[PDB]
């Protein structure tokens, strides 16, 4: 094929783009001794599918007369290779002077102009923050199709970051809503020992405290086994039936490999998107024995025409005349059979939406009349950024909206792994949009009687009962009965006071009698 | 001018002369952030003067770099703000333009090495860029452990022990005095969260219990306190006042603590042991609040004092200026005189390390150096290999890029006639041991060691029963007749006497009687 050569085309305004087109080989994790970029020869299909989605979006934005009338919109895509070292070089290249290959260190920029209008940002959170420092210092719009990391919401440190996917807080608030609505006020929480899970645990702990949900136990599991044994042992010791597992895919696979080694006890697992959708964990045998698995996945429209688009272009990308029209190696050797599995990928929409949003934001910034834009000097990024904070844009339908936090208002579906045979069937059992609507009669539990499994504690007690706290935040009590032959002298205290030799009382009594 | 000195090879110097925890990170009206309006900090100017003194020595001493002028250019980096532009200014090719290339092996940067920022966040942000060019970076005061991953930060080295050793010093100090029940305060920023998590892990592993963890508001001394912040501080200090714990470990920037200690003074509080982390352990400004004498005793963790000769008298393009710095330092000069150079040694050793590495790279004899173009990656390559004695100490770089220097535990003193930060113990990171604890003075009535512990040690014949979540809390209960506490095997339960023997209450023995 001649396909790498298509990762660039000219336009009056240029969009930069970052994707994980390639990846390092394990022996390719070389200790650099001369300052040059790692050559990521190894291919990866997800990035190419996302890049094709961007090409399709830009093609549509050019075709429609209703947007940017009279202007041609171009793109310029680079590989990230999922590492800061590789990602930072094209990050610098984007902000180079228009018509030049240099980045300038001036102390004021009032009439500086970089070669790209805005950047479709990287997928992973680490790259998102690393490049966010740079892009938000210059006040250049960055719009990410991934990077759910909640830390990016901070406008004190990431003024120009936007994303077309919900952040972690929406999913975790949905999980808290699930626990609250089902009445499971007593739970345990686990996370992966990476910034993702370690931030998720903080968010969820604060949310649980705010809503009166009590956390029995907290822990983190390593990424690639003593701590795994400790974590599952403590979970079993905690006397809990509901466990949240906000873990990356490999950490979940490690924990569930340990569970495969011995299923010490079954429990209701509240999953997360990454685990809830990743094959290598879903393939583990007999997982129905673990107890039911629940979790929220965000729902958006498919790109219906995308598979035909990829078919068409991979057919076209070898015509001997069309080739006349190497930032990715091995991109030119690909065949549709290795690409097919990802044509239905849900995240492509988030790429598409991002492009449209930027286009819409430009259309508003130019104040284009639908018959043609007015004459102006080039729009600078910081002009576009000011308009973009309050932006409503259609994406084929389903109009979305950015707000001050940089997130989009989007809704979630509650998915249940209804186990049949060796296969978990993903079953919808409710929706969340800021309030939770549950179709409770449809879920069948792992417990034989199919009644709701119970995970709760008391926070109230007849006054004749002890008040020894329990739980990680001391949000539960034991209610143990005050002894006969004693009286409950202090409300809400621990102790009880005993009576005379001829003095008798019932249990839970506040008094004694002759 | 003060901030620039020409030479044949130039060092980039980054210090935080002005700081504000709420500073703006992005451009203001497309001019680079200007720090002159933030609060000036004395100790940062002291460290900058330390760098200038080191280069003065190296230029005077013909034994080390004969005929080679060593120059410097210094730029103010103000906490987070102004992170990016100084890096580009260091990397630009003398007309403030930096060309983008696929290879930088032959690129002559404006500086050959960077004496890096004092803040962990700034260190990581700058390292993200300097990793591309492999431009050697040495940081003198950034302690966060994240910096040990040389696959992540290949270009970065340090001249101060990592956070692990600080936490170890604190833990061993607390163990030596057999404290068991401690309070932790953090400043609601990443430094506090990092060190709090690390301390939690170490303490939990070592049998001490954190009774209490709490977050301070990010107040500022120049700014008027709001009612809500006042209520928050009142809540915090009330929590401390009513609790039994009296060891208080504080992780905070010094700016944040002024209002906190003023509020503590309003509360008529007394009797605590303040374990001060490095970020404030040696602050001259806080020390001059002489009323603090009534809040207990102040012990801080710091790097070992080494008396620099001659430096005491030496102390007598945007963002390269500070007007108030000298006026501020002039007042504190006496207090600074008594306080032996501590972090100044980190700066001094960093500059000397670069000097020796360059001397070796040129293959220079102590008669002449064959001058040649130096590319930063070669200087990094040589920096990794140095080993030399400096002022009765010795510096060489570990595999993790750290340098071994003695840590020191210091008590604040207010006599003003001698050293205000008395040495009381020293921690050797190579041996991982706290050593040679000297005569601390206490607020107690007859200098008997104070303590805070959850539960007093039980009498003989009394078994333990855990009170709650913390292992450190236990009730004492006497063994029943016919049972005894085999303390050699268990502490939480009493074993029955042989079938021919019996025991009293609260007894470890058994005897042959009915
Ligand atoms: C995010 O951390 C922090 O904000 C704090 C406090 C801080 C705020 C603003 C500017 C500097 C420091 N950092 C530290 O204490 C770092 C550890 C790390 O940052 O890894 N050790 C510095 C010890 C010598 C020191 C040098 C400069 C000083 O003022 C200009 C100063 O007071 C103390």
> Best residue in B132, B196, B377 to probe A by mutation, most A CBs within 10 Å?
B132
* Residue B279 CA, closest ligand 1 atom number: 15
Report chain B residues whose CB lies below 8 A from the CB of A226: none
The residue contributing the CA closest to ligand 1 atom 18 is B142
Tally of CB atoms within 10 A around A373: 17
Assess contact for B322 and B77: CB atoms under 8 A.
Answer: no
Q: State how far the Cα of B28 lies from the Cα of A237, in Å rounded to an integer.
A: 55
Tally of CB atoms within 10 A around A38: 16
Report chain A residues whose CB lies below 8 A from the CB of B103: 34-36
Closest residue by Cα to residue B304 from B356, B364, B269, B345:
B345
Domains by residue range for chain B, with CATH: 4-161+317-396 (3.40.50.2300), 164-305+406-435 (3.40.50.2300), 455-514 (2.10.50)
In terms of C-beta density within 10 A (0-12 exposed, 13-18 middle, 19 or more buried), how is residue A326 classed?
Answer: exposed
> Best residue in B27, B78, B317 to probe A by mutation, most A CBs within 10 Å?
B27
The residue contributing the CA closest to ligand 1 atom 4 is B253
Closest residue by Cα to residue A2 from A333, A327, A332, A338:
A332
Which two tokens mark B333? 């000069």
Closest residue by Cα to residue B81 from B128, B136, B137, B38:
B38
* Cα-to-centroid distance, B279 and ligand 1 (Å): 5
- CB contact under 8 Å between B102 and A37, yes or no, is yes
Report chain A residues whose CB lies below 8 A from the CB of B376: 35
Q: State how far the Cα of B360 lies from the Cα of B346, in Å rounded to an integer.
A: 21
Report chain B residues whose CB lies below 8 A from the CB of A106: 96
On whether any CB of chain A is under 8 Å from the CB of B83, the answer is yes
Assess contact for B169 and B299: CB atoms under 8 A.
Answer: no
Report chain A residues whose CB lies below 8 A from the CB of B32: 107-108
Domains by residue range for chain A, with CATH: 4-165+304-343+347-401 (3.40.50.2300), 168-299+411-442 (3.40.50.2300), 457-514 (2.10.50)
On whether any CB of chain B is under 8 Å from the CB of A80, the answer is no
On whether any CB of chain A is under 8 Å from the CB of B188, the answer is no
Closest residue by Cα to residue B410 from B425, B393, B396:
B425
On whether any CB of chain A is under 8 Å from the CB of B445, the answer is no
Which two tokens mark B182? 């401690």
* Residue B277 CA, closest ligand 1 atom number: 15
Assess contact for B253 and B280: CB atoms under 8 A.
Answer: yes
Entry field: residues in chain A: 514
DSSP B375-426: -HHHHHHHHTT-EEEETTEEEE--TTS-----EEEEEE---SSS-SEEEEEE
DSSP state of A212: T
Assess contact for A12 and A71: CB atoms under 8 A.
Answer: yes
Tally of CB atoms within 10 A around B181: 23
The residue contributing the CA closest to ligand 1 atom 2 is B191
Sign of CA dihedral A166, A168, A174, A177: negative
Q: Look up tokens 């803040």; give the residue.
A: B119
Report chain B residues whose CB lies below 8 A from the CB of A89: 100, 132
Report chain A residues whose CB lies below 8 A from the CB of B96: 104-106
β-bridge pairing A423-432 and A436-438 = antiparallel
Residue A24 sits at the vertex; the CA angle it makes with A20 and A25, to the nearest 5 degrees, is 140
Which two tokens mark B202? 């170490």
DSSP state of B386: -
On whether any CB of chain B is under 8 Å from the CB of A468, the answer is yes
On whether any CB of chain A is under 8 Å from the CB of B106, the answer is no
Residue A35 backbone class (left: φ over 0; alpha: ψ -120 to 50; beta: rest): beta
Closest residue by Cα to residue B380 from A33, A72, A437, A80:
A33
Longest CA–CA separation in chain A, Å: 110
Q: Phi/psi at B254 (nearest 5 deg)?
A: -65, -35
Q: How many angstroms separate the CA of residue B141 from the nearest CA in chain A? A: 22
List Cα–Cα distances, A321 to A2, A56, B23, in angstroms.
11, 22, 57
Which two tokens mark B299? 């012990």
Q: State how far the Cα of B429 lies from the Cα of B166, in Å rounded to an integer.
A: 9
Angle between helices A381-388 and A348-366 (to 10 degrees): 110
Residue numbers after which chain A breaks, C to N beyond 2.5 angstroms: 224, 325
Q: State how far the Cα of B424 lies from the Cα of B446, in Å rounded to an integer.
A: 19
The residue contributing the CA closest to ligand 1 atom 8 is B253
Q: State how far the Cα of A221 lies from the Cα of A194, in Å rounded to an integer.
A: 9
Q: Phi/psi at B200 (nearest 5 deg)?
A: -55, -45
Which two tokens mark B137? 């970076």
DSSP H helical segments within A75-167, as ranges?
A: 84-94, 125-137
CB pairs under 8 A between A and B: 117
Task: Identify which of B121, B279, B328 to mutate to test ligand 1's pocket (most ligand atoms within 8 A of the CB).
Answer: B279
Q: Phi/psi at B203 (nearest 5 deg)?
A: -60, -45
On whether any CB of chain A is under 8 Å from the CB of B99, the answer is yes
Taking CB atoms and a 6 Å cutoff, what residues make up the pocket around ligand 1?
Answer: B 16, 19, 41, 43-44, 79, 118-121, 141-144, 189, 191, 253-254, 278-279, 343
3-state secondary structure of A489: coil
Tally of CB atoms within 10 A around A158: 22
Chain A's closest residue to B150, CA to CA, is: A31
Chain B's closest residue to A134, CA to CA, is: B84
| Nearest-by-Cβ selection for A468 from B85, B377, B468 | B468
* Cα-to-centroid distance, B180 and ligand 1 (Å): 29
Report chain B residues whose CB lies below 8 A from the CB of A35: 103-105, 107, 132-134, 376-377
- Residue B262: partners with Cβ closer than 8 Å, 6 or more residues away: none
Q: How many angstroms separate the CA of residue B176 from the nearest CA in chain A? A: 29
> Best residue in B75, B100, B375, B468 to probe A by mutation, most A CBs within 10 Å?
B100
Q: State how far the Cα of A496 lies from the Cα of A483, in Å rounded to an integer.
A: 8
Task: Identify which of B49, B81, B119, B218 to mutate to test ligand 1's pocket (most ligand atoms within 8 A of the CB).
Answer: B119
Chain B's closest residue to A112, CA to CA, is: B30
DSSP B309-348: SSHHHHT---S---SHHHHHHHHHHHHHHHS--SHHHHHH
* Cα-to-centroid distance, B254 and ligand 1 (Å): 9
Range list of β-strands (E), A193-233: 214-221
Tell me the resolution in Å.
3.6
- CB contact under 8 Å between B105 and A29, yes or no, is no
Assess contact for A450 and A443: CB atoms under 8 A.
Answer: no
3-state secondary structure of B210: strand
> Best residue in B12, B22, B23, B26 to probe A by mutation, most A CBs within 10 Å?
B26
The residue contributing the CA closest to ligand 1 atom 28 is B44
Residue numbers after which chain B breaks, C to N beyond 2.5 angstroms: 316
Q: State how far the Cα of B287 lies from the Cα of B266, in Å rounded to an integer.
A: 18
Closest residue by Cα to residue A149 from A194, A82, A89, A86:
A194
- CB contact under 8 Å between A133 and B128, yes or no, is yes
On whether any CB of chain A is under 8 Å from the CB of B381, the answer is yes
Chain centroid to Cα B266, Å, comes to 29
On whether any CB of chain A is under 8 Å from the CB of B108, the answer is no
């Amino acid at each position: 094929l001649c396909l790498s050569q298509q990762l660039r085309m000219k336009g009056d305004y240029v969009l930069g783009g970052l994707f994980p087109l390639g990846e390092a080989e394990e022996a390719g994790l070389r200790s650099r001794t001369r300052p040059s970029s790692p050559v990521c020869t190894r291919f990866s299909s997800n990035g190419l599918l996302w890049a094709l989605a961007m090409k399709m979006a830009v093609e549509e934005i050019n075709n429609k007369s209703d947007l940017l009338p009279g202007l041609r919109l171009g793109y310029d895509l680079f590989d990230t290779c999922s590492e800061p070292v590789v990602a930072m070089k094209p990050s610098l290249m984007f902000l180079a002077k228009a018509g030049s290959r240099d980045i300038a260190a001036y102390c004021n920029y009032t009439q500086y102009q970089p070669r790209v209008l805005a950047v479709i940002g990287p997928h992973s959170s680490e790259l998102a923050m690393v490049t966010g420092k740079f892009f938000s210092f210059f006040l250049m719009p960055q719009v990410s199709y991934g990077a759910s990391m909640e830390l990016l919401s901070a406008r004190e440190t990431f003024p120009s970051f936007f994303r077309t996917v919900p952040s972690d807080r929406v999913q975790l608030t949905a999980a808290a809503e699930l626990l609250q609505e089902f009445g499971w006020n007593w739970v345990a929480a686990l996370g992966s020992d990476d910034e993702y899970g370690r931030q998720g645990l903080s968010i969820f702990s604060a949310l649980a405290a705010a809503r009166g949900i009590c956390i029995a136990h907290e822990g983190l599991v390593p990424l690639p086994l003593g701590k795994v044994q400790d974590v599952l042992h403590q979970v079993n010791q905690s006397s809990v039936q509901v466990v949240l597992l906000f873990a990356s895919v490999h950490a979940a696979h490690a924990l569930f490999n340990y569970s495969i080694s011995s299923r010490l006890s079954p429990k209701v697992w509240v999953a997360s998107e990454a685990w809830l959708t990743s094959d290598l964990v879903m393939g583990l045998p007999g997982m129905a024995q673990m107890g039911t698995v629940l979790g929220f996945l965000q729902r958006g429209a498919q790109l219906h025409e995308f598979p035909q688009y990829v078919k068409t272009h991979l057919a076209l990308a070898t015509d001997p005349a069309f080739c006349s029209a190497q930032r990715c190696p091995q991109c030119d050797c690909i065949t549709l059979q290795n690409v097919s599995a990802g044509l239905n990928h849900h995240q492509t929409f988030s790429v598409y939406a991002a492009v449209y949003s930027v286009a819409q934001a430009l259309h508003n910034t130019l104040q284009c009349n639908a018959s043609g834009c007015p004459a102006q000097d080039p729009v600078k990024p910081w002009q576009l950024l000011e308009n973009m904070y309050n932006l409503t844009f259609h994406v084929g339908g389903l109009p979305l909206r950015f707000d001050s936090s940089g997130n989009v208002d989007m809704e979630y579906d509650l998915k249940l792994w209804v186990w049949q045979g060796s296969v978990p069937r993903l079953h919808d059992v409710g929706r969340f949009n800021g309030s939770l609507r549950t179709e409770r009669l449809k879920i069948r539990w792992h417990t034989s009687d199919n009644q709701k499994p119970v995970s709760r504690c008391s926070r109230q007690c007849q006054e004749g009962q002890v008040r020894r706290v329990k739980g990680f935040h001391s949000c539960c009590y034991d209610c143990v009965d005050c002894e006969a032959g004693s009286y409950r002298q202090n409300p809400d205290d621990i102790a009880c006071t005993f009576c005379g030799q001829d003095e008798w009382s019932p249990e839970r009594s506040t008094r004694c009698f002759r | 001018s003060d901030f620039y000195l020409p030479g044949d090879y130039l060092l980039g110097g980054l210090f935080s002369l002005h700081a504000n925890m709420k500073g703006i990170v992005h451009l203001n009206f497309l001019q680079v952030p200007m720090c002159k309006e933030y609060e000036v900090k004395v100790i940062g100017y002291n460290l900058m003067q330390a760098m200038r003194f080191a280069v003065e020595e190296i230029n005077n001493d013909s034994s080390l770099l004969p005929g080679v002028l060593l120059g410097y250019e210094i730029v103010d980096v103000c906490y987070i703000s102004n992170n990016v532009q100084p890096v580009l200014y260091f990397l630009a090719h003398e007309d403030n333009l930096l060309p983008i290339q696929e290879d930088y092996s032959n690129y002559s940067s404006r500086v050959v090495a960077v004496i890096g920022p004092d803040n962990s966040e700034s260190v990581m942000t700058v390292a993200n860029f300097l990793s591309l060019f492999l431009l050697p970076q040495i940081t003198y005061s950034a302690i966060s452990d994240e910096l040990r991953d040389k696959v992540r930060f290949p270009a970065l080295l340090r001249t101060t022990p990592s956070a692990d050793h600080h936490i170890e010093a604190m833990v061993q100090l607390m163990l030596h005095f057999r404290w068991n029940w401690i309070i932790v305060l953090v400043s609601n920023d990443t430094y506090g969260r990092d060190n709090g998590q690390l301390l939690g892990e170490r303490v939990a592993r070592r049998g001490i219990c954190i009774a209490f963890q709490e977050t301070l508001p990010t107040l500022q001394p120049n700014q008027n306190m709001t009612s809500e912040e006042r209520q928050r501080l009142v809540t915090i200090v009330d929590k401390l006042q009513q609790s039994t714990a009296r060891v208080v470990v504080v992780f905070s920037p010094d700016l944040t603590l002024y209002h906190f200690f003023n509020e503590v003074l309003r509360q008529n509080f007394t009797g605590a042991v303040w374990i001060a982390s490095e970020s404030w352990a040696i602050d001259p400004v806080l020390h001059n609040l002489t009323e603090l004498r009534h809040l207990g005793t102040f012990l801080g963790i710091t790097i070992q004092s080494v008396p620099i000769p001659g430096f005491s008298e030496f102390r007598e393009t945007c963002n390269q200026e500070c007007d108030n710095c000298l006026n501020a330092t002039l007042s504190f000069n006496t207090i600074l005189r008594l306080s032996g150079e501590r972090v100044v040694y980190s700066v001094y050793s960093a500059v000397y390390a670069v000097a020796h590495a360059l001397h070796s790279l040129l293959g220079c004899d102590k008669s002449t150096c064959t001058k040649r173009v130096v590319y930063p990656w070669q200087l990094l390559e040589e920096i990794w290999k140095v080993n030399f004695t400096l002022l009765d100490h010795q510096i060489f770089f570990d595999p993790q890029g750290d340098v071994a220097l003695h840590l020191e535990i210091v008590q604040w003193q207010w006599d003003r006639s001698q050293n205000p930060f008395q040495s009381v113990a020293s921690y050797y990171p190579l041996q991982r041991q706290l050593k040679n604890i000297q005569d601390i003075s206490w607020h107690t009535i007859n200098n008997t060691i104070p303590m805070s512990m959850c539960s007093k040690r039980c009498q003989s014949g009394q078994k333990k029963k855990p009170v709650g979540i913390h292992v450190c809390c236990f009730e004492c209960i006497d063994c029943l007749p016919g049972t005894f506490l085999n303390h050699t095997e268990d502490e939480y339960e009493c074993q029955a006497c042989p079938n021919n023997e019996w025991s009293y209450q609260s007894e470890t023995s058994c005897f042959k009687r009915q």
